[PDB]
């Protein structure tokens, strides 16, 4: 049994997408089907269900009036057309067998899912700022300094330190995705306190999609 989804991608608030699921390995015309969502880092959420013959359709209230589910049993294809997309609809969409039996149900088999991204902004470069300690804990003279990379649109951002000179103690962290639609990222290095007055600390941020190369006096 294989459930292969497609038809998703990057959309912007409003508008419409149409998701399609090709089914094989089983008698498609005899099973109910349902779509289920999973936002990045969040749990599962049922979207809509369609019966085997298509006579009965069900929708979650969070999608009612905006989504509509369709079936084509002769081609073994499941459809979910989504209108008036909002930021809440940003998630991975799974196609699943929603079976019906004598007193037993369930989402028997799942597809690998397709990504649907609703976002308003177009493309944006970052602004880099330092993160100085200003406090000295002096636990084996270990002081930690870094730089934050704020409000960039495309996820690829490569961060170096002292143009590759600084490799020991480097920690670049995964980014946030803010309600503004942009990403923010931070990188920190732990350094001996004996170097505060001798070693010049420099962070090297490169954001290729927008042609920004920012090196800040961390």
């Amino acid at each position: 049994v294989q459930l292969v989804e497609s038809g998703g991608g990057l959309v912007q608030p409003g508008g419409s997408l149409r998701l399609s699921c090709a089914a094989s390995g089983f008698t498609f015309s005899s099973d109910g089907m349902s779509w289920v969502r999973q936002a990045p880092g969040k749990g599962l959420e049922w979207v809509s269900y369609i019966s085997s013959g298509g006579a009965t359709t069900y929708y979650a209230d969070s999608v009612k009036g905006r989504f509509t589910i369709s079936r084509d049993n002769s081609k073994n294809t499941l459809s979910l057309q989504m209108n008036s997309l909002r930021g809440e609809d940003t998630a991975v969409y799974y196609c699943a067998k929603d079976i019906t039996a004598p007193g037993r149900n369930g989402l028997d088999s799942w597809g690998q899912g397709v990504v649907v991204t609703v976002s308003s902004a177009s493309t944006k470069g970052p602004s880099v700022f330092p993160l100085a300690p200003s406090s000295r804990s002096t636990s084996e003279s270990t002081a930690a300094l870094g730089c934050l990379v704020k409000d960039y649109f495309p996820e690829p951002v490569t961060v170096s330190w002292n143009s590759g000179s600084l490799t020991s103690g480097v920690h670049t962290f995964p980014a946030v995705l803010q309600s503004s639609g942009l990403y923010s990222l931070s990188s920190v290095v732990t350094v001996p306190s004996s170097s505060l007055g001798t070693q010049t600390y420099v962070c090297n941020v490169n954001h290729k999609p927008s042609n920004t190369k920012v090196d800040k006096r961390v």
Binding site: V36, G43, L44, E45, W46, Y49, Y58, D98, N105, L107
Partner: peptide, 13 residues
């Protein structure tokens, strides 16, 4: 997960 009158309700996980 549970079924309830067309609603498939998932727990937080």
């Amino acid at each position: 997960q549970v079924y309830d009158n067309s609603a498939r309700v998932f727990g937080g996980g």
